[PDB]
Each structure stands twice: as structure tokens, then as C-alpha cells.
Amino acid sequence: EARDILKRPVITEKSSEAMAEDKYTFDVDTRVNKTQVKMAVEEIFNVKVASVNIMNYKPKKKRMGRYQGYTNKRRKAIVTLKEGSIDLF
């Protein structure tokens, strides 16, 4: 726990526009709350977060060849830390 919920970071144009500011973007597990996220990040990177925002993305249709599928459901969190710098190197 506190490391199993941060699945991956998100590197995209909108996330990096948010990295110009102190907002960092992560791909978190689908069964966590803002609280559980704040704690995990401030535990790992030793940062002090001010706020965090969460959104749930629906499974998207993906056709691979002749077989249709659906992508996995996602939950994304945006942090806006005041003290610190999550370095994604």
C-alpha cells in the first residue's frame, strides 16, 4: 500500500502544461480516494501536497482486427503540490 496505487505517471501535452506549473499527473488505481492519493505521494516523494483532483474515464471501444474489445477503465488524479518536486526523470 501507498505504492500499489500509483500505477504509472502521465506524460502528455496537457499533463506537461501542468508540469510547467507544480501540477503533476499520475495514473492511479481505480479503487482509491483523493485522501489515499495525497498520503501516498507525500509518503513516497516526501512532498507536501496542497490539493488533488480525481476523474474516472469509461472503458473505450477498441477494435483489433476482427475482434472487438474494450480498453481498461481508468482513474486519474492531478496533484498541485506546494512544497516539493515529483521528479519523473
Partner: protein
């Protein structure tokens, strides 16, 4: 490689599970950021954590059943 793990006391074993879980995080954070290259390290540490938890279960289950 579960011999020395049996040789290891139940304490730092739980700490080994802990450390390997940390490593795994770092590997998958770097696979995403596209700085990994050694993508098979993920499976070896998954092996390692799996064995470490199996040994941890065997450690507590002998005691539970026998006294």
C-alpha cells in the same frame, strides 16, 4: 532461489517483500516514462516477491496448525 529465504528470519523477509515492492514501482514508473530498456526485470522481481510471500505464508501456517 528459495533456500536462503528459508534461511532468512521472518523479520527482514517482510522487509524484503517491502523493498522489492518498492523496486517494482520504480521499474514500472520508468517503463512508462520510457526509460527502462530492461523490461524483463519486472518479471524477475515479480518472481522474487511471489516466492517471498509464499515462504511467509508457510512460516505462519506451521505454527497455526501445530500449536
Amino acid at each position: 532461489k528459495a533456500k536462503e529465504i528459508r534461511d532468512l528470519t521472518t523479520s527482514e523477509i517482510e522487509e524484503q517483500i517491502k523493498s522489492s515492492k518498492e523496486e517494482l514501482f520504480n521499474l514500472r514508473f520508468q517503463l512508462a516514462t520510457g526509460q527502462l530498456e530492461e523490461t524483463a526485470r519486472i518479471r524477475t522481481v515479480r518472481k522474487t516477491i511471489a516466492r517471498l510471500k509464499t515462504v511467509a505464508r508457510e512460516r505462519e501456517i506451521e505454527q497455526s496448525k501445530a500449536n
